[PDB]
Design a protein around this ligand. Structure first.
Ligand SMILES: *[C@@H]1O[C@H](CO)[C@@H](O[C@@H]2O[C@H](CO)[C@@H](O[C@@H]3O[C@H](CO)[C@@H](O)[C@H](O[C@H]4O[C@H](CO)[C@@H](O)[C@H](O)[C@@H]4O)[C@@H]3O)[C@H](O)[C@H]2NC(C)=O)[C@H](O)[C@H]1NC(C)=O
Ligand SMILES: *[C@@H]1O[C@H](CO)[C@@H](O[C@@H]2O[C@H](CO)[C@@H](O[C@@H]3O[C@H](CO)[C@@H](O)[C@H](O)[C@@H]3O)[C@H](O)[C@H]2NC(C)=O)[C@H](O)[C@H]1NC(C)=O
Ligand SMILES: *[C@@H]1O[C@H](CO)[C@@H](O[C@@H]2O[C@H](CO)[C@@H](O[C@@H]3O[C@H](CO)[C@@H](O)[C@H](O)[C@@H]3O)[C@H](O)[C@H]2NC(C)=O)[C@H](O)[C@H]1NC(C)=O
Ligand SMILES: *[C@@H]1O[C@H](CO)[C@@H](O[C@@H]2O[C@H](CO)[C@@H](O[C@@H]3O[C@H](CO)[C@@H](O)[C@H](O)[C@@H]3O)[C@H](O)[C@H]2NC(C)=O)[C@H](O)[C@H]1NC(C)=O
Ligand SMILES: CCCCn1cc2c(n1)c(N)nc1ccccc12
Ligand SMILES: CCCCn1cc2c(n1)c(N)nc1ccccc12
Ligand SMILES: *[C@@H]1O[C@H](CO)[C@@H](O)[C@H](O)[C@H]1NC(C)=O
Ligand SMILES: *[C@@H]1O[C@H](CO)[C@@H](O)[C@H](O)[C@H]1NC(C)=O
Ligand SMILES: *[C@@H]1O[C@H](CO)[C@@H](O)[C@H](O)[C@H]1NC(C)=O
Ligand SMILES: *[C@@H]1O[C@H](CO)[C@@H](O)[C@H](O)[C@H]1NC(C)=O
Ligand SMILES: *[C@@H]1O[C@H](CO)[C@@H](O)[C@H](O)[C@H]1NC(C)=O
Lengths: 746, 745
């Protein structure tokens, strides 16, 4: 049982976020990677790691966790160290006498303003060198000094990142080994033809945020004199024949010199966000130079204060023969016509068009059918009617446009966050065969009645979340006979009113429906039909409703509410304010359940016996309740249960014979409870057990001699992992107070 | 000592002993006690020895015992000669128990399992004024009919209030005392009211017959109609001698016809609740309207015809005979358009102040119609379609809470248009309205750019509610037409705020010369355009809860460092729920010097620079609850002379500095509950002077109960002027024995 770290093969010592004061001295021989991020370590000496020659990767990010002291040659011993992460350590300098074995070194987010030869030029094996985010924004720092020729000695260097430092010119004498070069936000105003002249291997170049476009910047932003464009010499890119990625976002570009791409036949991704390129999108000589380009990002090039009637796309867009994705967020215009996108219509591979955040008031949807294979039509965040992760893209989020669960079904159309407050009879005509539709957050209050989706009747995943839907007709959505996933979360507006009717009967009319989400609808009363019924349904999410009201002891109408979900395997009843479940109501839950969540309720009572009616239940989640008794006879009540989740309850005593003969149970979580001790027969199985994971952190353990039968049990069963031992802590007595229980003389 | 377990206070001696997990009555009750509240504990037995040394009790409350039956002997109570009032609600009692004292003037047996009202239990108690017997047999509880022993209430000739509602009776019991003022028989399974059921009750001011022959369609509880969904049947002459009736409740009694005859001899009738009947026909032609010239409140709500969405509502011209009507509630009638002509009858009523039309799915309104009334104060149009468990002491048919927030309605004429679809306010939206002072436009899906002209037709609005919209704050003259605005709620308009790349402008704030309260809560504010500071000469309160001051004040951004400094008159600032892990010194120092109240609760603060309080001489209250602070300063009075309340509950303090209390000086209230304290060392309570503390909170700390805590107990024994709530929850964590034993024992 490793302590304090958590070990595994995958051979990694996970030692992060554990209030460590110093490199622990207790780590296994077979360990090759040590992760000590997020601790309180302030010193590193050549002792620190002395009995650890086999380490190939150390991670010391974020130490002390709110300046790390490192002795010259501290790691110099570690003769197999390939990767050293020293991010966010308040380091005032590159550490002296780093080992030559390093292929990877990260000094992101430090106070290093001097990039010296003593520092680095030594380390001739480097492939990846990260020096970003040392001087930036309103931080108190100095201009970055790069010793001349410091990088030329690193002749296998492939990735150099110096972003978010004050450099003012590209540094000279860079090794021709380079594949990727990040120079974003370095306050460079001029690129000469010398700067990159030798880098014949470069696949990526990032010059974003030099001469930034500052208007409405969400960060401290300093533009070049007068808002000036960055100045890029005609021949600056002439020997960059392998470039596939070019980031020129926020460089205040008004004009794109086509000749920049004369010698760049492989360009795949061009990022041109936050520029002033309305004019060049209408004209655009440079589009003829990019016949292999697959992704083009021209987001946020809107003219301050303008709201043009229409968008203006050059005919030269038809020359982007390989184009797969076109991002045109934040251009800002009122109407999209069939004609305005003619140049895009013959591109064979264009599968994504993104027009989010343009305040578009109207669109001629028939246009979209005139395309070869659009798969994703993203119109989120428009007007349509009836603090910076260093390792992430700085100019936008990188999560996919459409949830992949929805996109997997086919053609997707995302109309979320609009003003489509009522769906009328022709709203969806002239559309392609949409498989995935997002109407989330449209302030939609209509009564759906079985015809609104008849022009796209093959929708398979329908997102209707965050509306105000009025469920006053039993034929709602029944035109969608292939429906597989229906999300109705956050439609509480009408559900919360007792006096209006509420019809959930249409659920039974689907033959392929597998997942239904009814969460946060405040459901506590229904009209006429009190049961949910489906033959197909496999997961129901019912969190954030009022079962406590539906199952009131004095009302029997909802006693069978879920029973007719004949195929259900997964049911989520969290956040339903449940004090107790009536025995009849619990026994009327579908017997096909394999997963049941009743967490974050106020349960003061669970009848363990009724599990006997649930021969397939593998997971029971009772976290975040107020339970205070565990049955002593669980072996009698289930033989399928694998995982019991009982953290954040008020369990004070673990009964003797609890494990009894529960052979199937593997994961038992009893963290954050009121356990003062565990006794021998609470632990005894005479059977063959599968238990491998047992969570006990956050209990107020009594660290008298009564704790020894459990300490002994830990040694007796090293096959059972107890995570976060350093959080398995002595409450009493006061000297023991704050001790981990394993750290005690018994 | 200090009283224990109960809290003792004086009012009009009350001993609050509620909700403490008491396994039994204490024998540590102050012999001076007159009112004993023991509700919501785990008491399972009551005996003749339970209240042994306790003559002086006039009132006992034992409701909700045991929390999850209560067992009470014959005459456990009669030894209490001064007991007038005895509350035994929700105790799962099989029986009106025996030998209750003759002194009783009030007895409550609401919410038990009693189906036998016998002479044996009830008829000896001739001093009763109020007898509450409701909610023993109802809905789908396992349940026998209520047997009311013949003439069992006739000897209680002091009885003014009898409530038997929510029991199965089938008829009004006969032989009821003529002293009755108030009679509650709602939901008792009565289908017929006879000539004879009320004729000796010439003193009745209130009769409740609601839920007899209920209208059951879409009911939120198990509801059983009368055969054929038939109406309650009430003899023509049933109310003949009810001359004193002020209040009649006939809700949910399936009425289609109101016999104007029922009111012939009811000249004082003031409130008539007819909710949930079938009265659309009567409302259209009601002869009974001519019988009610002193009616003040008429509730006709939820009388809709199922499946009908009529174009207009049909108000009988007879409504104009209700010359005393103050309020008219017509929710849930259901109709599409309100026209000027529809309400003609109402318009010459002198005192009609409240018109309520919530939940009618109305689509179009002729707003100028409202000008034509005498003095409308409240125009409640919430929950429509306008475009550009059951507490036994509550009213069962609706909530009683006000229709308009009092703070808003205090300014004058109120118009509530919350929960509509007024997604855009256009040039004439508000023409021909009266002079509106309080305007509620919450939850209208409104996403427009407010530009300073949208309220021009009601320029004297002083309380504006705009919460839960999607407002696009892109123009610095927004709202500036409202020169008299004092209160502005912009909570939950995060839609556009959360998007970094659109413009956000709050400069309009400085323009208001009368603005006192601004609520910007839960807007997810983390970036604004061009102007980064909030400025106002007048503003007194700003709620900035649930935004991202963690981003606005991130260490490498100086832009928002004086965000709140231009609020020169501010005294209350709320900065809770902003995810703050630390406030930078300078940003703290730039908070208004006028502050008297600062809330920085429910953030993640690890450190607090106490020294900085030196800049806030008026600061009286500091709320740091729900953070992660480990450190208290040892030199507080070096930094404050003003602080009276310091709230520190739910932090990580496990040590109090030497001298800390009586450092306090002006400090009246210290809350240190839910921390990590093991003791309070003599040092901590040492105190150079004598503490000014009157309240100290310490419960839910993990105290170590060894002779190490004697110091503190003797501190506690000395200073009886320092109250400690919840001593039951001031608990031993260690050793064991004894955890869970209060440090008081
Ligand atoms: C039919 O119509 C009549 C109205 O004409 C209605 O009668 C009202 O019933 C309620 C009880 O539901 C009475 O309200 C209570 O009155 C007492 C004493 O004045 C108060 O103590 C009660 O307050 C308690 O609870 C309150 C909230 O739960 C708390 O504020 C407080 O702490 C108290 O513990 C409560 O206000 C009301 O007095 C009568 N009206 C008259 C004029 O007597 C009746 O309820 C209707 N029937 C149905 C079934 O809805
Ligand atoms: C300008 O555009 C370039 C090219 O698109 C961006 O390069 C991309 O940068 C991100 C984050 O800096 C890289 O992601 C990270 O890299 C590795 C993947 O090997 C992964 O371990 C991390 O989780 C993280 O995903 C991404 O690799 C990189 N793209 C390529 C092809 O190298 C760049 O970020 C943009 N510049 C700015 C300031 O936004
Ligand atoms: C309504 O309920 C549905 C169904 O539970 C929610 O969608 C589901 O969301 C979970 C994420 O919480 C998805 O699980 C994830 O799958 C990915 C990739 O396969 C995996 O990496 C994650 O570890 C996790 O397993 C699940 O796929 C998804 N199901 C579907 C069908 O989309 C939905 O999010 C809920 N809606 C709201 C508004 O909360
Ligand atoms: C937005 O902020 C305002 C100002 O704080 C909120 O209105 C205020 O709400 C508080 C309650 O949090 C009111 O105080 C209470 O008032 C009653 C009446 O005296 C009293 O019984 C209580 O002791 C308490 O003091 C305060 O009066 C009120 N102020 C105004 C001007 O209305 C408002 O609720 C917030 N809005 C939202 C949606 O959260
Ligand atoms: C007060 C509401 C009574 C029953 N009712 C009427 C409804 C409705 N439920 C409901 N849920 N929606 C409606 C939409 C348009 C017109 C009428 C209705
Ligand atoms: C991507 C938008 C750039 C700046 N901008 C344009 C806006 C706006 N912010 C904003 N907040 N609202 C708008 C409403 C209508 C038309 C344009 C805008
Ligand atoms: C389109 O993409 C396909 C990959 O599915 C590829 O094989 C083909 O080269 C591309 N065609 C053009 C014209 O770029
Ligand atoms: C729909 O849009 C909302 C908001 O833009 C987003 O949160 C959600 O994931 C989207 N749904 C799908 C299925 O992509
Ligand atoms: C039940 O669910 C399974 C998925 O496990 C599906 O294949 C089967 O068709 C469903 N049964 C019915 C009757 O729909
Ligand atoms: C406005 O309407 C909402 C929704 O009905 C309500 O919660 C809020 O308190 C009302 N505001 C005022 C000021 O009365
Ligand atoms: C400051 O606030 C007080 C209290 O509302 C008010 O009386 C006074 O007029 C305000 N001062 C200014 C300059 O607006």
């Amino acid at each position: 049982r490793s302590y304090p770290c958590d070990e595994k093969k995958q051979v990694i010592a996970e030692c992060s976020n554990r209030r460590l004061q110093e490199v622990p001295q207790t780590v296994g021989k077979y360990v090759t990677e040590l992760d000590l991020s997020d601790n309180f370590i302030t010193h590193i000496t050549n002792e620190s790691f002395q009995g650890l020659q086999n380490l190939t990767k150390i991670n010391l990010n974020h130490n002390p966790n709110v300046g790390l002291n490192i002795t010259d040659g501290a790691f110099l011993n570690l003769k197999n160290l390939r990767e050293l992460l020293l991010e966010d350590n308040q380091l005032p300098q590159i550490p002296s006498g780093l080992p030559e074995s390093l292929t990877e070194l990260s000094l992101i987010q430090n106070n290093i303003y001097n990039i010296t030869k003593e520092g680095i030029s030594r380390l001739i094996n480097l492939k990846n060198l990260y020096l970003a985010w040392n001087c930036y924004f309103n931080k108190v720092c100095e201009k970055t000094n790069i010793e001349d020729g410091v990088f030329e000695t690193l002749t296998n260097l492939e990735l150099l990142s110096l972003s978010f430092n004050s450099l003012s010119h590209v540094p000279p004498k860079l090794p021709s080994s380079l594949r990727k070069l990040f120079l974003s936000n370095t306050q460079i105003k001029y690129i000469s033809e010398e700067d990159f002249k030798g880098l014949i291997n470069l696949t990526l170049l990032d010059l974003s945020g030099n001469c930034p476009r500052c208007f409405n910047a969400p960060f401290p932003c300093v533009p070049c004199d007068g808002g000036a464009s960055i100045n890029i010499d005609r021949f600056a890119f002439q020997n960059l024949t392998q470039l596939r990625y070019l980031n020129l976002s926020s460089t205040s570009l008004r004009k794109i010199n086509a000749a920049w791409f004369k010698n760049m036949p492989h360009l795949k991704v061009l990022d041109l966000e936050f520029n002033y390129l309305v004019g060049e999108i209408a004209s655009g000589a440079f589009l003829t130079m990019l016949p292999r380009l697959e992704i083009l990002d021209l987001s946020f090039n809107y003219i301050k204060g303008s709201y043009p009637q229409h968008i203006n796309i050059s005919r030269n867009f038809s020359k982007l023969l390989s184009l797969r994705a076109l991002h045109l967020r934040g251009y800002v215009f009122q109407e999209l016509r069939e004609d305005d996108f003619q140049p895009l219509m013959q591109l064979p591979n264009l599968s994504t068009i993104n027009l989010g955040i343009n305040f578009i008031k109207q669109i001629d949807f028939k246009l979209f059918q005139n395309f070869s294979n659009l798969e994703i039509i993203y119109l989120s965040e428009n007007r349509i009617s009836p603090e910076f992760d260093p390792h992430s893209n700085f100019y936008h989020f990188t999560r996919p446009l459409i949830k992949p669960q929805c996109a997997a079904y086919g053609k997707a159309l995302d109309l979320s966050l609009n003003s489509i407050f009522f769906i009328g009879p022709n709203q969806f005509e002239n559309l392609p065969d949409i498989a995935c539709l997002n109407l989330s957050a449209n302030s939609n209050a209509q009564v759906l009645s079985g015809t609104e989706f008849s022009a796209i009747p093959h929708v398979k995943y329908l997102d209707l979340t965050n509306n105000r839907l009025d469920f006053d007709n039993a034929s709602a959505l029944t035109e969608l006979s292939d429906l597989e996933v229906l999300d109705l979360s956050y439609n509480s507006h009408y559900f919360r009113i007792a006096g209006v009717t509420h019809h959930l009967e249409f659920i039974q009319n689907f033959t392929n429906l597998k997942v239904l989400n009814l969460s946060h609808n405040n459901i506590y009363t229904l009209t006429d039909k009190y049961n949910l019924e489906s033959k197909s349904l496999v997961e129901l999410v019912f969190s954030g409703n009022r079962l406590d009201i539906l199952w009131n002891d004095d009302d029997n109408r909802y006693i069978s509410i879920f029973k007719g979900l004949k195929n259900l395997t997964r049911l989520d009843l969290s956040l339903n304010r449940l004090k107790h479940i009536p025995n009849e109501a619990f026994l009327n839950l579908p017997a096909s359940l394999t997963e049941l969540h009743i967490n974050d309720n106020m349960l003061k009572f669970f009848n363990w016996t009724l599990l006997q009616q649930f021969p397939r239940l593998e997971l029971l989640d009772l976290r975040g309740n107020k339970l205070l008794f565990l049955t002593d006879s669980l072996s009698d009540f289930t033989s399928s249960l694998r995982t019991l989740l009982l953290s954040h309850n008020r369990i004070s005593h673990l009964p003797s014979g609890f494990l009894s003969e529960v052979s199937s149970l593997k994961h038992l979580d009893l963290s954050s409870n009121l356990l003062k001790t565990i006794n021998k027969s609470a632990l005894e199985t005479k059977t063959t057990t599968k238990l491998s994971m047992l969570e006990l952190h956050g209990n107020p353990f009594e660290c008298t001699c009564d704790i020894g039968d459990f300490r002994r049990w830990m040694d007796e069963h090293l096959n059972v992992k107890i995570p976060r031992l350093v959080d398995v802590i002595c409450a009493s007595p006061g000297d023991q107070r704050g001790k981990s229980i394993v750290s005690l003389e018994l």
